[PDB]
Nucleic acid binder design. Structure first.
Ligand SMILES: [Mg+2]
Ligand SMILES: [Mg+2]
Ligand SMILES: [Zn+2]
Ligand SMILES: [Zn+2]
Ligand SMILES: [Zn+2]
Ligand SMILES: [Zn+2]
Lengths: 162, 162
DNA sequence: TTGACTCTCTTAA
DNA sequence: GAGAGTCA
DNA sequence: TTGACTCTCTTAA
DNA sequence: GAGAGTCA
């Protein structure tokens, strides 16, 4: 098994490589009508992506390092969390983008939580709009708002009460 | 079926059958420290479910009727909305449970909206906690809360800024 | 050891 | 959150 | 005609 | 949101 020192070395090489990705400045809603700025370190759209990186899906990548003749591979956003527990409450931990920008690999924009927690950030009002996430959101979720419901609750007769 | 009269007759038969489902009272969080009461009309756990109903998955059912000698079949929660547009902004409209109770077929607990709007209600603070859904929630979403994040954003070196 | 592709899978609406 | 087929 | 089962699919994290 | 194979 890789030692803790070897894992730290993987994290360090990952950070060195991601730190050289293009840094894109994004203005974002924070909630409460306020605007903030996030700086995303974005993996390229096409190969080459950076040392150790390869695309396994339209917006999926992996990081690969060969240590003592053994090939090791990780989901590209999971590397910051290799020294953390990988499950909680019986649920697998997932890399969760606080910036909601899948190409971003900035570890200051990532957290490590259940898929339900991850998804729920899409609708959060944001750090200045009422976020209650214990690990606070960096921005209002992209899907926050009144929604676009086509039809509401209704009945034709009198068979039902709410 | 094709005619508006045929569609209304399908809605009316569906309402009459679902109206005979057992009515189960559920006390629910509303947000803001308040609690409310919903009356769900719950399809039975096992066959027979009711005239026209059959189970196609653990928590999936379909409603079927024979019209002009042809069988017409629908997802069991979609029937109230058969006269509504079946898409919005190019996204498929889905039956969305405001009571978050899949066995419930009370149309006063259903709306018709994109799958994203549907999902997002799981995290809504609720009608007394700040819900901004234009078609208002009936309860706080079951997944609302601080979450259980295992690790937050972090870096080992000095290559990243928020 | 490394890059650039390929494939399928998980979850819960 | 969906559609459709196999039997009786 | 109606009932009770079977199977796979969609979406976007 | 994931893991794993092939080829040079
Ligand atoms: Mg996410
Ligand atoms: Mg729902
Ligand atoms: Zn980012
Ligand atoms: Zn939040
Ligand atoms: Zn209900
Ligand atoms: Zn709401």
């Amino acid at each position: 098994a890789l030692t803790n020192a070897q894992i730290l070395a993987v994290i360090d090489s990952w950070e060195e490589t991601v730190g050289q990705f293009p840094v894109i400045t994004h203005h974002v809603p924070l909630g409460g009508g306020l605007q903030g700025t996030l700086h995303c370190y974005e993996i390229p759209l096409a190969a080459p992506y950076g040392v150790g990186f390869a695309k396994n899906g339209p917006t999926r990548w992996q990081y690969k390092r060969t240590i003592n003749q053994v090939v090791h591979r990780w989901g590209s956003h999971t590397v910051p969390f290799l020294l953390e527990p990988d499950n909680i409450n019986g649920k697998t931990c997932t890399a969760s983008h606080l910036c909601h920008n899948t190409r971003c690999h900035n570890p200051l924009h990532l957290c490590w939580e259940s898929l339900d927690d991850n998804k729920g950030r899409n609708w959060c009002p944001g750090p200045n709009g009422g976020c209650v996430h214990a690990v606070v959101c960096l921005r209002q979720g992209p899907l926050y708002g009144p929604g676009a419901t086509v039809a509401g609750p209704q009945q034709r007769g009198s068979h039902f009460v709410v």
